[model samples]
Target: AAQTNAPWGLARISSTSPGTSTYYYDESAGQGSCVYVIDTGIEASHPEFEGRAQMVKTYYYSSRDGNGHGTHCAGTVGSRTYGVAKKTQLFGVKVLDDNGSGQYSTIIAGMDFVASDKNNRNCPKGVVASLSLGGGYSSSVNSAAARLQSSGVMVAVAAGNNNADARNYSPASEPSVCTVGASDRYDRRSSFSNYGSVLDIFGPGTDILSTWIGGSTRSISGTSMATPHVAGLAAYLMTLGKTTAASACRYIADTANKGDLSNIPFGTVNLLAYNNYQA
Candidate 1:
């Protein structure tokens, strides 16, 4: 049987009621500036995504959607119908084919595109880029990613879902990349998530809810979903002076909601105190 890696739309509710206290409710204060979902082509017309997300460029490096992994990952970040960064604009880069495989060269090209195209076809320049997929981490791509960061674009990558050391790969292991690990809804490290000191943070990735074609919904599980949660949150904070990639990362580390984990994992940043940053 084919394994399902779809993102299930899970509503995360605080302990208190909506009006009970500040900790009870929090939604996007305004447009989350702009962020990019660098994955398979988003089902742009999907009801959950229509008119809600601005697709800057839709290029396909792959021929088909055999596994539907990219679509699921896209939904988690900004499906609008059901995503953590629902209001953030997404730039879909079809680096992988339907078979979920793409050459490192293609991925490198995609990175160059995102960095060079400051307008992002029309969006702002400082948009954060969320990469939910991982490969062998080509030094070329790592250099490209570093250049992108130096130019002010924040790039976040998933700490490969292999359950092995994330140091095995290029980008995830790279010193500059914001490597992310996976945590269940209850805030426990996911069994399949790669963990290491390089990990920048963790997010809900066990069973996530996201949109599919034709107004359908799928509950998927993977570290892929976790990466976007941070991506969206970073975009939301950008409105409040999380302007540069470093600032956005600092905000994530400073404001993350600490989970129930015994030892605070590497890069356990918090954003809950951001309400205090409001002018």
Candidate 2:
């Protein structure tokens, strides 16, 4: 039988309440978009990817992800069975290494590739990128992300898992990027998720199930895990004609579920991610 119990995070993101276990979304869902997952790397041969996940660029030795973080994030963005934008193309832009660590040098190199890559040729569809990595304040990193955004890729970045104001973080604090916080299955802001006005949206981050390395699946938590959900949503929005970052963000904010979330911190918008779909 087909899996009846939808992943709680997917169910929550597509619904107005947590009482339901079904995921509802537009049928077109990210059909014309390409998402660059900037993380450790991805197991591009994973069955769940249906051959759609490709390692376009890497700073490490191979396309395989020894850390698992990048594959998990890529799965959330476009894996066939568990992704939000099920039809969106997934490109693994590996910057981090096996230990899941990367300096701005590697990270900047990865971002620069996405900004100018020939595959990112569609201006109307633009390009969508998922950044699940974070670091201390770095203007160079922030500047690279800004240039990437200005070059027409809609960037979704983690708001950090520090449980403090996200303003102290790099790309999260960068206004040019779409910073995302985290929420639990209960529709409350995740305790570990960085808050404050720096966040543009919140997605389910607690025990989220998604694709893992070596053709497996895993459930994990972090603001890192939540970033791709927003990125996937932005891709779905691109298929709906909100092709530009500014318009897609505006549409997401306007159509977001405003009253479904709680324990919102001061300065943060009281909004939860939604797909504008009904069950």
Candidate 3:
């Protein structure tokens, strides 16, 4: 039988209102929104991306998916079959190299490029900055995220896979960004996910299937996987007219499936739910 339902994350947020579901999955699906995948570069030739994926800039190396993490993350954010926002313009802002290691300064510069890019500024709606990388606390990264948020770009970052307090991490702990932790299909926090007041929400990350390098698809796991779910949702919200990062954050929190998590820290995070939008 052909699959009629949306992906788990998208199903959770699907709206039954007249025309809204179509808007999410077809009509708009983040039309007019721009999303930046800040990690290793994406595979621009991936069929799932439908030619929308482009490497706009790079800080350390060629803007190509030598490492597959960024490509997978990009899939979840905007790929046609595996993404949350299917039509959002996707940009690869490579910070990490082929070895998947990058300096903090390099990552910061990548963020700056995304925020200041004239092409991004031309987006008719909203811009989203999605980061799946993390490290020890860095005030510079935090401040850069804050600056991007202030400029109306929604920033979504992974809450790290350390299974500890996310407050100890850099961009995850940054108050301005929407820090995401991982949840399983059961709606429980993944054993490897970090928690704490810093976490804004949780999404399915375990064994998630998405686009990969070499024009393929694969399943991967991590809070890294969860971050793009929120990033994609941010694009959808923007399409719905949540223009600013702060407003998008508020809509996500306000519409989330509150108090539904099990086997996770309480009062620290909300589970992302997508059925609340009225139109």
Candidate 4:
């Protein structure tokens, strides 16, 4: 059965234009791939994730999600009801807070797990990480981003919500990471997104509806919401023999919807993420 009020972001990616409640994609998307959400903890019990989501590590000392952001990002990454990759396994690397803040000390350690985790290596296809957190230039995250790529973990990161050039931000500034900026349903860049050369792609991010705490969903807005969609795309593409992170990245950029988006900053690539699968 077709869904009622299904996600417009999901519909937007698989189609060349907006205006359908339909999410066009193959039913076998992201099979054998794993996605790591390097954010606040995931609501592992969230029904939207089905049985695919779990906690991989917790630098925050507790695996439970005190902040809902991680769960939200996870929903976009692979939750069955609200995700881009339906068959992917979801893991949470908790680097959280009661507020939305996290320390580099923990995030670095968290990435350590993502790069060296047994599941990341054991997964049949590619492993992808979605980094929605943002901060000033951190040599720590910069190196961490590079390390993930070396370990064959593709990373899609938020370009930040500062609306400035993303080159000044950590993780996003890391060239090895696929930096993502936000676009709306109209295919125009979202006002809150950081843009410029650092961005490798764009995604629908405004009022994105995804799984939330307490077995519910919420409409949230940010580059945070946008990055996971690409992470899911990378995982999905890898299942089709785009086995490496580098290959998946290139394939996504090459096959993306071109010139369909507007208000894209000059340095940011005009490419919008696409899976090219349809029911």
lDDT of candidates 1 onward, in order: 0.62, 0.84, 0.80, 0.85
Comparison by TM-score, 3 against 4, better one? 4
What TM-score would each prediction reach against the true structure?
0.80, 0.95, 0.91, 0.95
lDDT of 4: 0.85
Better of 1 and 4 by TM-score: 4
lDDT for each residue of candidate 3 in 1-279, tens digit (9 for 90 to 100): 012454555554454221122324435678888899999999989989999889888876477789899999999999988888888999998999987789998888888888788353567777899999989898998898788777768899999999899888988999978888887766778889999997888776877888888888888889999899889988887886754666777678777777666777765766564535553
Q: Which ten residues in a row have the lowest lDDT in candidate 3?
A: 15-24
List candidate 4 segments past 4 Å from native: 1-4, 119-121
Query: For residue 272, what is the lDDT in candidate 4?
Result: 91
- Clash pairs detected, candidate 3: 12-274, 13-274
Tens-digit lDDT track for model 1 on 1-279?
011222322233222111121221135521545666666656666777656554455446333334566667767766754555556666666676666666777777777788877553544434778887777756786787777767778888887888777777657776686777776654557778877777777766777767664457787777787887777666656654545566766667665545444234455432121222321
Q: Write the per-residue lDDT of candidate 4 for residues 102-211, one digit (tens) a residue.
A: 98877777787888894535688878889999799888888988888777788888999998999899888998778899999888889898998878888889989999
Least accurate 10 contiguous residues by lDDT in model 2: 118-127
